């Protein structure tokens, strides 16, 4: 079995920094030449940046460069830009005249360090359309914040909720490097109609922000 | 330009088989080598097998006993078949000429194959409405909640793709019901709530269902 080992598995770097990703193959690649580097951005298919170890494909920014020899290969980003957030993979081609194989490295996640940013918080009551279905979804939006760690707590008539919410988080935005997060509180219609004040509290560092609404008032 | 269009079922039952195909346009599949690669949700890229330009198939060790890669020279297609599937085989499958040592590289768009015994179910789309009277400063948030669908994926656009700035479509979360939910949100200037119409376009191809939801204040 053929293996390609990338290191690090992930890294955090600041814009303008120089980033280095190494890739060690368990055996020689075809013609000591067939190694490529791929970039995969959130929700996208992988995009090839380099081929033949060091050939930069047209249109790719020149800050990406490939090097190496034998079974040791390297991807270098000279000056990291926010749009470079992605997972990077090496891929090698192997075999003989009567055997052909490929292998991917495990991938290197490149995260963008940036300044702390507080989220803009929005709360959404369930729609009247959904309530007719017997279920009520209350949604709390944390928009464009950094870092990723944030504590979201739900209160219904000042009663802290537990076990009835789910969170989802976007990946770093390619432009400002922030995250966004949704927390959805799921109640039965019957339960939702038994209470008045709904509130989502977001704690980041030394600050807690609570957004609320009163059922029946918009 | 050259294109490589992927097709094939998305939902497959445990113990069954998947069958994916890729049709080339602007060139010939029978004159190049093509790989099949897959990526489980949130995981790395895995090479399945390679079909040389000469028509010989070589498979990675793990895939050999269940996989078959073929090509139809008349149809100008390449095809992957895998049997005895398990939940572990759920992944996005791609066809690709990886271009490790050559300048020509091309990838299909990718197709999610979900291995599950559950049935297809189209989504319900509910508005995440902005309050007619602003609660924030200038920037208002609105969106659509896409709830109770299976399998993945849904896609969401705003105003048929004309609205892209400030859009955050969150990853789907699997609910305790075994059905998926996700929200798509967009931040807009609050003064435009009276002027601009905001419609979220939700496509769930697995169920051949599209939903357009006009999101109005309050």
């Amino acid at each position: 079995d053929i293996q390609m080992t990338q290191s690090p598995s992930s890294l955090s770097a600041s814009v303008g920094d120089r980033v280095t990703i190494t890739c060690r193959a368990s055996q020689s690649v075809w013609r000591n030449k067939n190694v490529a580097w791929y970039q995969q951005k959130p929700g996208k298919a992988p995009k090839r940046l380099i081929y033949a170890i060091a050939s930069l494909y047209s249109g790719v920014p020149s800050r990406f460069s490939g090097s190496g020899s034998g079974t040791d290969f390297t991807l270098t980003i000279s000056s990291l830009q926010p749009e470079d957030f992605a997972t990077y993979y090496c891929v090698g081609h192997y075999g003989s005249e009567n055997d052909a194989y490929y292998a991917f490295g495990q991938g290197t996640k490149v995260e963008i360090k940036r300044t702390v940013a507080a989220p803009s918080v929005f709360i959404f009551p369930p729609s009247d359309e959904q309530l007719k279905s017997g279920t009520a979804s209350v949604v709390c939006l944390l928009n464009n914040f950094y870092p990723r760690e944030a504590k979201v707590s739900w209160y219904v008539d000042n009663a802290l909720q537990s076990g009835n919410s789910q969170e989802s988080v976007t990946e770093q935005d390619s432009k400002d490097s922030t995250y966004s997060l949704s927390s959805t509180l799921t109640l039965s219609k019957a339960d939702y109609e038994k209470h008045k004040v709904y509130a989502c509290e977001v704690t980041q560092g030394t600050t807690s922000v609570t957004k609320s609404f009163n059922r029946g008032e918009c | 330009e050259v294109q490589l269009v992927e097709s094939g079922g998305g939902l497959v039952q445990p113990g069954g088989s998947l069958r994916l195909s890729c049709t080339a346009s602007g060139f010939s599949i029978d004159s190049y080598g093509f790989s099949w690669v897959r990526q489980a949700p949130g995981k790395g890229l895995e090479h399945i097998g390679y079909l040389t330009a000469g028509g010989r198939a070589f498979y990675a060790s793990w895939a050999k006993s269940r996989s078959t890669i073929t090509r139809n020279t008349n149809e100008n297609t390449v095809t992957l078949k895998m049997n005895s599937l398990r939940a572990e085989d759920t992944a996005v499958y791609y066809c690709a000429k990886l271009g490790t040592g050559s300048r020509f590289a091309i990838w299909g768009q990718g197709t999610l194959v979900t291995v599950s015994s559950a049935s297809t179910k189209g989504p319900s789309v509910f508005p995440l409405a902005p309050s007619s009277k602003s609660t924030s400063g200038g920037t208002a948030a609105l969106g659509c909640l896409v709830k109770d669908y299976f399998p993945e994926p849904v896609t969401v656009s705003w105003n048929s793709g004309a609205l892209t700035s400030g859009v955050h479509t969150f990853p789907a979360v699997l609910q305790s019901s075994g059905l998926y939910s996700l929200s798509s949100v967009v931040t807009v200037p609050s003064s435009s709530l009276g002027t601009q119409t905001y419609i979220c376009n939700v496509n769930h191809k697995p169920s051949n269902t599209k939903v357009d939801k006009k999101v109005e204040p309050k």
Binding site: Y94, G95 | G33, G101
Partner: peptide, 6 residues
């Protein structure tokens, strides 16, 4: 050859 297997 640009690839193995040929």
């Amino acid at each position: 050859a640009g690839x193995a297997g040929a």
